[PDB]
Amino acid sequence: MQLVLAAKYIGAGISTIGLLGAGIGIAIVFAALINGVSRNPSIKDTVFPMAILGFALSEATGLFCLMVSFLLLF
Amino acid sequence: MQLVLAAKYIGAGISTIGLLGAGIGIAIVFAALINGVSRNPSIKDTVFPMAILGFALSEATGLFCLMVSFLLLF
Amino acid sequence: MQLVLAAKYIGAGISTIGLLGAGIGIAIVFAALINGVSRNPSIKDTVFPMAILGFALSEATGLFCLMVSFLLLF
Amino acid sequence: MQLVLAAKYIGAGISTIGLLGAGIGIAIVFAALINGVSRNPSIKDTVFPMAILGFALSEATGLFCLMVSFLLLFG
Amino acid sequence: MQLVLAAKYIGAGISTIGLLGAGIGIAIVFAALINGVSRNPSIKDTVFPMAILGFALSEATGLFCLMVSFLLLF
Amino acid sequence: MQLVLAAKYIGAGISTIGLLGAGIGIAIVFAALINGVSRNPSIKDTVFPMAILGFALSEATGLFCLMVSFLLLF
Amino acid sequence: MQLVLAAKYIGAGISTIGLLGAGIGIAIVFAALINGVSRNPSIKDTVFPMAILGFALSEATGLFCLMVSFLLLF
Amino acid sequence: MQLVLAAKYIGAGISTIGLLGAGIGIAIVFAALINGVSRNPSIKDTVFPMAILGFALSEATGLFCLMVSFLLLF
Amino acid sequence: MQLVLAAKYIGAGISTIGLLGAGIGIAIVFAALINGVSRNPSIKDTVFPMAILGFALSEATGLFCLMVSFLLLFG
Amino acid sequence: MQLVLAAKYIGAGISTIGLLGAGIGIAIVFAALINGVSRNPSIKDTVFPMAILGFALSEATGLFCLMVSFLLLF
Amino acid sequence: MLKRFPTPILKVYWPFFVAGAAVYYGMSKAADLSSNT
Amino acid sequence: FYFMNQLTYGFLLMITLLILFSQFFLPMILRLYVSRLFISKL
Amino acid sequence: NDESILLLTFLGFTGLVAKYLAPAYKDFADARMKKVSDVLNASRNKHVEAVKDR
Amino acid sequence: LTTFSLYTIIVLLVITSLYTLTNNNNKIIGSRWLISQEAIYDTIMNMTKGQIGGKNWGLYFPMIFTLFMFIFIANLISMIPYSFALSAHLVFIISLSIVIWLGNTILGLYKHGWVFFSLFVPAGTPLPLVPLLVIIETLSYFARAISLGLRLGSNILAGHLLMVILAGLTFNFMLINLFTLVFGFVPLAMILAIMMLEFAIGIIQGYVWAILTASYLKDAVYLH
Amino acid sequence: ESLVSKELKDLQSTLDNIQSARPFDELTVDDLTKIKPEIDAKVEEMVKKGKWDVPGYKDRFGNLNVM
Amino acid sequence: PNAKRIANVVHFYKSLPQGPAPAIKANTRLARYKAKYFDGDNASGKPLWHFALGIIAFGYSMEYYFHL
Ligand SMILES: CC[C@H]1/C=C/C=C/C[C@@H](C)[C@H](O)[C@@](C)(O)C(=O)[C@@H](C)[C@H](O)[C@@H](C)C(=O)[C@@H](C)[C@H](O)[C@@H](C)/C=C\C(=O)O[C@@H]2[C@H](C)[C@H](CC1)O[C@]1(CC[C@H](C)[C@H](C[C@@H](C)O)O1)[C@H]2C
Ligand SMILES: CC[C@H]1/C=C\C=C/C[C@@H](C)[C@H](O)[C@@](C)(O)C(=O)[C@@H](C)[C@H](O)[C@@H](C)C(=O)[C@@H](C)[C@H](O)[C@@H](C)/C=C/C(=O)O[C@@H]2[C@H](C)[C@H](CC1)O[C@]1(CC[C@H](C)[C@H](C[C@@H](C)O)O1)[C@H]2C
Ligand SMILES: CC[C@H]1/C=C\C=C/C[C@@H](C)[C@H](O)[C@@](C)(O)C(=O)[C@@H](C)[C@H](O)[C@@H](C)C(=O)[C@@H](C)[C@H](O)[C@@H](C)/C=C\C(=O)O[C@@H]2[C@H](C)[C@H](CC1)O[C@]1(CC[C@H](C)[C@H](C[C@@H](C)O)O1)[C@H]2C
Ligand SMILES: CC[C@H]1/C=C\C=C/C[C@@H](C)[C@H](O)[C@@](C)(O)C(=O)[C@@H](C)[C@H](O)[C@@H](C)C(=O)[C@@H](C)[C@H](O)[C@@H](C)/C=C\C(=O)O[C@@H]2[C@H](C)[C@H](CC1)O[C@]1(CC[C@H](C)[C@H](C[C@@H](C)O)O1)[C@H]2C
């Protein structure tokens, strides 16, 4: 009936607030990068790649969240 | 169909608070920034160009839930 | 008909707790500002905008949720 | 219409606990202020205005919550 | 017609955890109040008035919620 | 009118989760107390009263939220 | 009338996660206790009774929560 | 009759994630353990019994949580 | 009777997010491990067992949560 | 028949947000890694493998959550 | 009054004006195609 | 209704302010800067 | 009227402004004015001194 | 004639009223009214100097000024109660943001051609995730566009409407029995604090606009 | 011998003119442009190249900015 | 040395005595406004407030022309 499409919409709604954790995590990654480079700048060139390493595949698990909404949206 | 629009409205409602990390995450970045430049002053123009980049990458993923809420309202 | 407006109202209710993000975020920004000016009295200028700058970035995110509530309230 | 006011009331209910943000936030602001004034004796009069600055426009967000819980409750 | 008072009661129930903030918040204050004297046993009667003032106008935030709960029970 | 007391019960259910804030805060109080007394063992009769009083005063977070249920239970 | 008992059951279901903070709070207490005893190894017998005192009443929040869950289950 | 068992099942569902709390809390114990011996090597005999004591009687909380969930299931 | 299976399904859904606890917990354990091994390079084999110890019977508890969901999907 | 698949969809929705723990922790790991390697550069070869260890066996657990969603979506 | 100085506003900011015209044309399409709602 | 109205008058004012500022109001204060520094250096 | 309360808030705000910010901004502008004028006069004074020393 | 067009004329007249009548017949002394624009000029100058830091950095210094003043003035005129919001229109602000973004893209394409897309590879990354990191920024590059304006508008729209809604609060608070006249002052001071935060959400948000677009011009002109 | 007798009275007349012709608290940049086209030329070159940063200014004249 | 001398002998000779800048009857039914509120002597912010009242009137009149 009309219960399927309504539940699909509210499910796409609920299945999107999981990016909270990815956002907080990449934020603390940048925070640790800042707290580390300000203590020793001459290591940035070494830690900045790894940092943006630790960034990417820490958001990727969060990137699935809205994706799960997308396939549930349509 | 006077039922599915109410459901998509409340779905935009639940998918509105997904910016919670956008309210927190970016800030703690600046937190370390304040803990970064106040410790060592002469790294300001070195940590700020990447601090704003971290802010951009933080509000990027901290906003897709909000645009999901927009497109689920309509 | 008499169901969609109640749902819009409860959606404005559920989307209200999105301002939790700003309340958690801007706080640690001012906290780091106080901590940085405490251990370094003569750097506050260098860090006075950069703190409140981040304020206007986190506060605004809070200012998102409720306005999405407002356009959902009316 | 005899049903919408119940939803208004429960919406004011769910739109009231949002001051969790203010309750945690102003508290941690005062905590950092305590730490600062402790580790620096001669900075109080310099930080306390700014700190209370970082109170006022740091709590209005929470205010928003209950003013929602004031308009969906009564109006 | 029997739905409105049950809704009022569950609304008083759902709005109980707002002072949740205070439940943690004020405590954090005393946390610093302990850390403000461990590394500085001298300054006690100067930080204590500030700490109790912060406690007061932070608990106020906790309340602004349970008085809503009270006036919604009625 | 059998729905009203069932609603009272189910609303009192999530009124007892207000001690979450207590359960965290009145524990971080003793955490800070331990972390402070280990740094200076000689200051014990001075901060323990202080440490507690805050525990008492700050407590009740869950206790004033659990009263709702009881009041809401009866 | 066949709903009041199921409602009591499900309300006991949403009265269980209130010990949530307990499961964290008291735990981190021992964490600080470690940080209390591993930092200054001459404080164990001094603050271990203080530690168990801070544990008991603080867990008492989880005690209250799950016993309210029991009394709502019956 | 056909609804009370579904309510029991969803109540066992909503009373399950309370072990969330312990699921985090116990871990920080080991954290302090790693932060207790890394800067003080010969301290295991003093901290490890205390650490496992805290671990056990804090995980008891999540244990009671999921056994409440199980007894509400059946 | 047609509602009970959907109820079990949404119960398996709600009881699935409990591994949040393990995900945060084992992570703080490994974070403290990295902080300790980087602060004292001569402690690795001294702390590595306990650390991974602190892993297993932490996350296993979180595992228990979703295995409830398992026995709530069919049983 | 039309009631159960929509409930399965919303169950996938509610279960999707379990990657919160991944998004937080698989990034706190790299945060602590950066904080450790910045204050001591030459320990990367000692930590970086073990460090990335602490990533995998964590994030995979979070993965389990959303794959449950798949077996609840289909 | 105010002495005019020949400051470069065209030989510096040409892509910005180009993008402004492009957005004007896009909004022309948008409000000439979606104005029937 | 007034998308064209707002957008067109706004772009008119944008180009107006760009030309106006860049040609009159930044250099009129740069003149004060140069005069002060030229009287100082001499 | 409803919005008249907002006009009263604006009146009270501008009263607080004319009470607090106006004299502080006046003092700041006067301090900068005196500094700039004093340095501008000292430049010409040193120029005249160097011209007389030649 | 439109209220919005007349508001644009108001903005232009106020901008003229900040320099023309300000200048006391071209005096070096720099009178008080000139010190405000002096401070604005200096705080934008020392900002964009350290932001982009290029050997030829002042060439784009005009726009970073005119994008600020417009936002600094159009968000201080509507502060008057009996007026209408100028910048709360999401359409126009988002359109301005899209104009600036597309202009930056065209500038970068005309200046660097193919290599302009080297911004999407920040630093050293392992091979199996080289495109992945590009992805998020791939979509993030244009989310940068829509958000840049959407923030300020969603602030302004949330601001003025706020000052309206709670206004009715104090209107609906003083039409019930006259006993409400006692201790009915803290909502008045609350609206006062709302206007206090309003002025911030205007000025500091204009600053935010300036600093973000300065960083974006830096990214669009230079390749890291 | 006459060169010094001319150059001394030249600086003497300069000092006698500068003693009574210093309206520094009310001087106008229009007069400076009328006496010195170098001001306008330097402004024009500075704008054409874009050297909005004026060196040697911040040291004796504070930037007076918010930050 | 010689440079400062040849510079300040040229910078000084055309400079006007002191003060003297009344510009006769400086007025044009708007210019007076500048002499009263916008000189280095008064420099008071009142006009801003005055201008505020303008909008406080203008929109109100517009109110008086739209809603009431
Ligand atoms: C009245 C508000 C709170 C504080 C006010 C004043 C009390 C002083 C404070 C320092 C403590 O109570 C105390 C140390 O003085 C105290 O309790 C002593 C008298 C006592 O001898 C102490 C050594 C204990 O051992 C005492 C903590 C208990 O024996 C211990 C087994 C656990 C705690 C406990 O059950 O007490 C709680 C607590 C006081 C809590 C908190 C009391 O109160 C009780 C009774 C009221 C309700 C039932 C609460 C429930 C709680 C979970 O919210 O539990 C009350 C039952
Ligand atoms: C009401 C305005 C606030 C005023 C100023 C702040 C501090 C109070 C201060 C002057 C007191 O004297 C005190 C804090 O120092 C105090 O209580 C000590 C003197 C006293 O000796 C102390 C050790 C206690 O015994 C005291 C903690 C009581 O035993 C305990 C049962 C109090 C309960 C409590 O949580 O207090 C709050 C608090 C005062 C708060 C804060 C009080 O007030 C109460 C009552 C009003 C509402 C209900 C609030 C918030 C929430 C309970 O809704 O809780 C009130 C319930
Ligand atoms: C006031 C609260 C607690 C009382 C006393 C606390 C402090 C005094 C102190 C000296 C205690 O004796 C203690 C800390 O040593 C203590 O907890 C012991 C009894 C405990 O057995 C401990 C020494 C252990 O053996 C420990 C290593 C075990 O692994 C642990 C799982 C023990 C059992 C346990 O947690 O059961 C609980 C607990 C005792 C708890 C603890 C009760 O009690 C039980 C009783 C039944 C109900 C279900 C409660 C609820 C639970 C949430 O507290 O749990 C009870 C069911
Ligand atoms: C009082 C609570 C705990 C009791 C004792 C705690 C402290 C004493 C201490 C000496 C224990 O023996 C212990 C810490 O060594 C311990 O946990 C061992 C039994 C444990 O096997 C440990 C040594 C390991 O082998 C460990 C490396 C494994 O990876 C771990 C996954 C072991 C199994 C496990 O977690 O199962 C649990 C656990 C034992 C837990 C632990 C129970 O028990 C089981 C029993 C069945 C139910 C389902 C409970 C619920 C769960 C939430 O505790 O889980 C039980 C199902």
Q: How far apart are CA K28 and CA K37, in angstroms?
A: 16
The neighbours of chain P, by the rule of 3 or more Cβ pairs under 8 Å, are L, M, N, O
In whole angstroms, how large is the CA radius of gyration of chain H?
18
Q: How many domains does chain P have?
A: 1
Distance CA I37, CA I43 (A): 6
Beta-carbon count within 10 A of N200 CB: 17
Distance CA O52, CA P5 (A): 29
Spatial distance between the Cα atoms of F73 and G11, rounded to a whole number of angstroms: 11
Question: J55 vs A29, E14, J24, J49, CA distance in Å?
Answer: 14, 37, 12, 10
**Which technique was used to obtain these atomic coordinates?**
cryo-EM
Say whether C56 sits in a helix, a strand or coil. helix
Q: L39 and M44 in contact by Cβ < 8 A? A: yes
**Which sign, positive or negative, has the C-alpha torsion E63, E66, E68, E74?**
negative
Structure token pair of residue G56: 């008991």
Name the CA radius of gyration of chain E, rounded.
Answer: 18
The residue contributing the CA closest to ligand 2 atom 8 is E56
Determine the Cα–Cα distance for residues C36 and B41; give it in Å rounded to an integer.
11
* Residue in O4, O64, O65 to test binding to M, most M beta-carbons within 10 Å: O64
CB N220 within 8 A of CB N107: yes
Q: Is F50 in the pocket of ligand 2 (CB under 6 A)?
A: no
Which of N163, M47, G65, N65 is closest to D64 using CA atoms? N163
Pairwise CA distance, residues N64 & N45, whole Å:
9
Q: Give the whole-angstrom CA distance, residue I17 versus residue J14.
A: 8
Q: How many CA atoms are closer than 13 Å to the CA of G63, on its beta-carbon side?
A: 8
Among the partner-chain residues N62, N66, N92, the one whose CB lies closest to the CB of L6 is N92
Q: Cα B66 to the chain's mean position, in Å?
A: 9
Q: Which of C11, M3, C13 lies closest to D66, judged by CA?
A: C13
Domain total in chain M: 1
Distance CA P5, CA P8 (A): 5
Q: How far is M43 from chain P (nearest CA, A)?
A: 11
Q: Which atom of ligand 4 is nearest to the CA of H19?
A: 52
Half-sphere exposure of residue B21: CA atoms within 13 angstroms, side-chain side: 31
Whose CA is closest to D49, among B27, M27, C37?
Answer: C37
Q: Are G68 and G15 in contact (CB under 8 A)?
A: yes
Q: Please list every residue in chain O whose beta carbon sits closer than 8 Å to the beta carbon of residue N39.
A: 64-66
Which residues, numbered 23 to 42 in chain H, qualify as contacts with chain I under a Cβ-Cβ cut-off of 8 Å? 23-35, 37-39, 41
Min Cα–Cα distance to chain N from A1, Å: 36
> Hey, where are the domains in chain B?
2-74
Determine if ligand 1 sits within 6 Å of the CB of residue F57.
Answer: no
Q: Ligand 3 centroid vs H57 CA: distance in angstroms?
A: 7
Name the nearest CA neighbour of G63 among H71, E19, H64.
H64
The domain F2-74 belongs to what CATH superfamily?
F1F0 ATP synthase subunit C (1.20.20.10)
Cβ neighbors of F6 (< 8 A, separation 6 or more) are E6, G3, G4, G7, G8
User: What tokens appear for N224 in the block?
Assistant: 């890291």
What are residue C31's phi and psi, to 5 degrees?
A: -65, -50
Atom of ligand 2 nearest to the CA of F57: 27
> How far is Cα B69 from Cα G58, in angstroms, rounded to an integer?
40
D26 dihedral zone (left: phi>0; alpha: psi -120 to 50; beta): alpha
Q: How many CA atoms lie within 13 A of L34 on its CB side?
A: 25
Q: Which stretch of DSSP H or E encloses residue I59?
A: helix I44-73
The token pair that represents A36 in the structure block: 């580390």
What is the phi/psi pair of residue A36, to 5°? -90, -40
For residue H52, the Cα-to-chain-centroid distance in whole angstroms is: 13
CA atoms of F69 and H15, how far apart (whole Å): 17
Residue type at O4? V
* M and P in touch (3+ CB pairs within 8 angstroms): yes
Q: Which chains touch H (3 or more CB pairs under 8 A)?
A: G, I
Q: Give dist(CA J31, CA P51) in Å, integer.
A: 54
Q: How far apart are CA O48 and CA O52, in angstroms?
A: 10
- The one-letter amino acid code at I19 reads L
Query: What residues contact residue I57 under an 8 Å CB cut-off, 6+ apart?
Result: none
**Physical contact, O and N (3 or more Cβ pairs within 8 A):** yes
L38, O39: Cβ pair inside 8 Å?
yes
Transcribe chain N into DSSP letters.
--HHHHHHHHHHHHHHTTTTTTSSTTBTT--HHHHHHHHHHHHHHHHHHHHH--TT-GGGHHHHHHHHHHHHHHHHHTTSSSS--SS--HHHHHHHHHHHHHHHHHHHHHHHGGGGGGGG--S---GGGHHHHHHHHHHHHHHHHHHHHHHHHHHHHHHHHHHHHHHHHHHHTSSS-GGGGTT--HHHHHHHHHHHHHHHHHHHHHHHHHHHHHHHHHHHHS--
Which chain C residue shows the shortest CA-CA distance from O65?
A: C45
Q: Is the CB of G57 under 6 A from ligand 1?
A: yes
Nearest to O18 among P5, P12, P16 (CB): P12
CA E54 to CA E72: how far, in whole Å? 28
Q: Is F56 on the interface with E (CB under 8 A)?
A: no
Kindly report the CATH number that applies to the domain delimited by I2-75. 1.20.20.10
Pocket test for ligand 2, best of F57, F61, F65 (most atoms within 8 A of CB): F57
User: Which residue of M25, M34, M51, M53 to mutate against O (max O Cβ within 10 Å)?
Assistant: M51
Best of N46, N137, N140 to disrupt the B interface (most B CBs within 10 Å) is N140
Q: Is F57 in the pocket of ligand 2 (CB under 6 A)?
A: yes
- Beta carbons of J6 and A8 less than 8 angstroms apart: yes
Spacing, Cα N151 to ligand 3 middle (Å): 52
Tell me if C18 sits within 8 A of C65, measured CB to CB: yes
CA distances from D65 to B27, D20, H47, N162 (A): 20, 10, 45, 12
Q: What torsion, rounded to 10 degrees, do the Cα atoms G55, G56, G58, G59 define?
A: 100
Q: Number of Cβ pairs closer than 8 Å across D and N?
A: 20
Q: Distances in Å between the alpha carbon of F65 and those of E19, E61, E63, F32, F57?
A: 8, 14, 11, 25, 15
Burial class (CB in 10 A: 0-12, 13-18, 19+), M49: exposed
Q: How far apart are CA E51 and CA E31, in angstroms?
A: 10
CB contact under 8 A, F25 and E26: yes
The answer to whether N213 and N67 have CB atoms below 8 angstroms apart is yes
Q: E37 C-alpha to center of ligand 1: Å?
A: 26
Count of residues making up chain H: 74
Domain range enclosing P23: 2-66
Q: Map residue O28 onto helix, strand or coil.
A: strand
Distance CA N199, CA N193 (A): 10
> Does residue N6 contact residue N14 with C-beta atoms inside 8 Å?
no
- Cβ atoms of C34 and D33 within 8 Å: the answer is yes
Contact J40 I39 (CB under 8 A): yes
Q: Say what the resolution is, in angstroms.
A: 4.2
Residues facing residue O28 across a β-bridge: N27
Closest by CA position to N38, among listed C62, O62, C63, I57: O62
Cα-based torsion angle of the residue sequence F39, F42, F45, F50 in order, rounded to the nearest 10 degrees: -30
Residue K19: exposed, middle, or buried by beta-carbon count in 10 A (0-12, 13-18, 19+)?
buried
Select from E51, C47, C43 the least CA-distant residue to D43. C43
